[PDB]
């Protein structure tokens with residue numbers, strides 16, 4: 005039903021892509037971060053058409069170029085707009101294994117890969133990318149803004165109104181619980197936790213995901 | 221067309237909708253669940269949204285509403301008082317909100333308070349505080365000190381608000397001072413919930429100030 009963007013901090017937005025699946029509409033959340041030197045994209049739209057809207061939005065309202073885009077794993081909902089991003093000269097950057105799994109599933113090829121947990125800064129804004137272990141996918145990573153204390157958990161974290169874990173096909177049900185606990189131990193002062201497919205909240209989203217993982 | 225979303229393990233935001241001046245406007249309140257019942261911050265935006273709200277609480281929280289607390293006298297935060305009261309729920313407000321309610325054909329609250337109050341129900345602590353006139357002369361906020369969640373109602377604007385919105389009953393000269401009182405009473409608030417837009421961090425307070433140096 006399109007693409008929606010909402011502001012949560014003075015320099016942080018959440019972009020939301022929609023797709024109707026069977027019964028009901030499913031959102032997909034990413035982040036936009038504005039810096040003094042360009043915008044950072046955490047996740048593409050849920051495919052090409054949401055991603056073209058997202059780019060058009062960034063150009064109209066932030067009136068700055070996207071310096072980089074960082075998918076959080078290989079699935080279409082977090083990376084299916086990569087081709088759209090790369091066609092505008094924006095570098096897409098992923099973990100090494102996200103690049104591997106994309107190649108094995110005929111997704112595009114990132115422009116750069118990283119094999120290490122990385123902290124970097126653009127335009128006064130610092131970002132951390134971190135691998136807590138397999139959960140939703142073997143390669144899912146999170147992104148932390150330590151200044152705004154905002155943790156983006158992608159499909160690794162579920163929202164407080166999710167009643168189960170959804171699809172478990174590529175899922176790593178055995179590792180997911182320890183990945184959550186890694187997040188709880190590494191970001192003890194996170195203020196906002198952003199899931200992919202529901203509303204965001206406080207650090208209750210980690211304990212709720214842990215709870216879903218002890219009741220299956 | 222009521223909607224309820226959870227933001228913390230014991231905190232929901234209830235949202236009614238209306239079109240106002242060609243745009244869709246949400247109105248958010250809180251539901252707080254406690255070991256001894258539910259606390260309601262704001263009613264629905266009128267009778268039908270509030271009975272939806274009441275039914276929601278009974279179906280999913282399956283506990284009675286112990287008290288309801290409107291944050292000022294306008295319909296979006298108080299227009300469902302009768303429906304709450306027909307179910308025996310106590311409505312309690314500041315003394316000045318009761319005066320303005322009587323002055324504008326809203327109902328009569330069951331209890332009024334003239335003091336900033338900290339109280340607890342079922343393990344849950346709540347703070348009600350009057351920072352001064354802003355959106356209306358009587359607006360108060362609600363703070364959950366354990367979750368560090370501040371409900372600012374219509375005193376705070378969301379980060380995509382381009383102006384102050386409804387200013388009819390507003391007190392534009394005091395409003396800046398109330399925002400600064402909030403900034404200094406809740407320096408470590410994690411979430412700030414406005415009435416008529418998405419919630420965020422304490423950026424929402426500095427943003428509301430900005431709308432107030434540039435009107």
Ligand code: NA
Pocket residue numbers: 099100101102142143144
């Ligand atoms: Na990997």
Ligand code: NA
Pocket residue numbers: 203204205225226227
């Ligand atoms: Na939310």
Ligand SMILES: [Zn+2]
Pocket residue numbers: 041042071126127
């Ligand atoms: Zn830059």
Ligand SMILES: [Zn+2]
Pocket residue numbers: 039040041042067068069
């Ligand atoms: Zn720029």
Ligand SMILES: [Zn+2]
Pocket residue numbers: 077079081140141159
């Ligand atoms: Zn996925």
Ligand SMILES: [Zn+2]
Pocket residue numbers: 087088091
């Ligand atoms: Zn292309």
Ligand SMILES: [Zn+2]
Pocket residue numbers: 072097124
């Ligand atoms: Zn990079």
Ligand SMILES: [Zn+2]
Pocket residue numbers: 097098099118120122133
């Ligand atoms: Zn990386």
Ligand SMILES: [Zn+2]
Pocket residue numbers: 129130131148149150151152153
């Ligand atoms: Zn940061």
Ligand SMILES: [Zn+2]
Pocket residue numbers: 079081159200201
């Ligand atoms: Zn997903």
Ligand SMILES: [Zn+2]
Pocket residue numbers: 161162163166199200201202
């Ligand atoms: Zn989710």
Ligand SMILES: [Zn+2]
Pocket residue numbers: 175176177178
């Ligand atoms: Zn497995």
Ligand SMILES: [Zn+2]
Pocket residue numbers: 292294296355356374
């Ligand atoms: Zn009002």
Ligand SMILES: [Zn+2]
Pocket residue numbers: 293294295296
């Ligand atoms: Zn009114």
Ligand SMILES: [Zn+2]
Pocket residue numbers: 312313314332333334335337348
């Ligand atoms: Zn009071």
Ligand SMILES: [Zn+2]
Pocket residue numbers: 355356357358389390
């Ligand atoms: Zn007034």
